[PDB]
């Protein structure tokens, strides 16, 4: 029981820190040393990380983000059992790949918001909304939602490449500056980090949350229940997906026996105060 690598886009995203922690504590119990690297969405960084597996510095790798699927596939095919992909909205041939139903969860969350009476929506993404991007199952869900309700997408209320609370502060400051009749009713943030920042700037401008603008988080990160306006958010089952990923790696490594069990990884809407 050797060295395992975990790859994520950004360790200061509490979702990824928490996912790492749950994987690492289990793998550690099994005798492995686990190390994490971050990519900042650079395919070169992914490729460099994978060279560690190719050179057998690592026994195995868990990727919780993927930049170049075809590159990951070639490595997985050369190293059967040693590459696991978790929650990256992709199935990589040659790697056991765990996908969660983010499209569904996003539709469900948007539906919740529509049902509270909201009609003018702002949509925030960590990707470039116009092109191919991470979190595009979610973007499609948003577009499908709007079409299903015959809601015109306001291009001025779309915000791409927004990741952090500080970036969310900038979004929220812009939204707070708007005249009530062009202000959104609700903001789908795609991230609890972003949501905390958005809400802070709204509140600083005496915009009421949720009465004036409802704010939907994503992930149910550790700080979410503790936020100034406790976050309504989409809960990701961090502990369960970590256990699943870990097991699929350990099985591939010949460590663990197959289980008949297969608990399903569920996203759930967590209603608090912000929406």
């Amino acid at each position: 029981t050797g060295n395992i690598g975990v790859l994520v886009s950004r360790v200061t995203n509490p979702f990824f820190a928490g996912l790492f922690d749950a994987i690492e504590r289990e793998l550690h119990a099994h005798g492995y040393q686990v190390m994490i690297t971050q990519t900042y969405d650079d395919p070169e960084a992914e490729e460099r990380f994978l060279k560690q597996l190719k050179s057998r510095e690592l026994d195995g790798v868990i990727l919780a983000s993927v930049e170049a699927p075809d590159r990951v596939m070639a490595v997985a095919k050369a190293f059967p059992g040693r590459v696991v992909v978790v929650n990256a909205d992709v199935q990589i041939p040659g790697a056991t790949s765990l996908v969660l139903p983010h499209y569904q969860a996003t539709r469900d969350a948007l539906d919740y918001l529509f049902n509270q009476g909201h009609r003018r929506f702002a949509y925030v993404s960590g990707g470039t909304i116009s092109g191919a991007h991470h979190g595009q199952s979610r973007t499609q869900a948003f577009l499908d939602f709007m079409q299903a309700h015959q809601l015109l997408v306001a291009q001025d209320l779309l915000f791409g490449q927004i990741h952090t609370a500080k970036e969310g502060q900038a979004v929220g400051k812009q939204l707070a500056s708007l005249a009530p009749n062009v202000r959104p009713d609700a903001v789908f943030t795609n991230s609890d980090e972003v949501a905390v920042g958005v809400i802070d700037s709204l509140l600083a401008a005496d915009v009421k949350v949720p009465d004036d603008i409802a704010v939907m988080g994503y992930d149910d990160q550790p700080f979410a229940p503790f936020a100034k306006i406790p976050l309504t958010t989409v809960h990701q089952p961090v502990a369960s997906m970590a256990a699943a990923a870990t097991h699929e790696l350990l099985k591939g490594l010949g460590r663990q026996v197959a289980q008949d069990t297969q608990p399903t990884l569920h996203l759930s809407l967590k209603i608090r105060q912000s929406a």
Copy 2:
């Protein structure tokens, strides 16, 4: 420009995630691949990590926590230039070691609290307060403070091995349960994670923060200004200490030239709302 390891106690501590991120972005710019491991205070995990340097899997290591100084010293002496220690309240012979003045900062923060009128203090530590522990410069500062003001230490208001927001919730629930005359005036939490949890439980019990109980954070983590009651806290200069650590590693590796400059790493009290 090869592989660098960073060692911390816990990646879900936002202080360590942020310190890692600042180190990693700089080292990445210099062509290195950086990976982080967590120890959970297990000396075995530290020793295993150091074997990576001993076997030349890694070019160098930055430790932001230290479990067994004498073990780290033996490695540093065998691998000159390749071990840097940052903000671990220890100078390790053979490793460039950066120490920040936590005793001073702690005294200063406690003094701030005394000056606001507080007299009955609760003290929380991530260590076992009675024995040798991480963060013991801070514990000594606390004891020295109390002695300097002839304040009797209440053993019932000392809380050890408290790290997370959930643990802080438990502390805060206990404190909120107390009759006003044995309730503390102020709580020194040693951690913004702990402080968020403490405050949440106080507020849940209609205890006023800071009017009934003032809560002092530590670190000035990303969420601190965004907390329900924005945290008064001790600010650690994460970006500056990361740059310093990185430079001392790169110098040791023969990458970088010596600088005459040497900006001093300052802790500062950040006053917000919670105290």
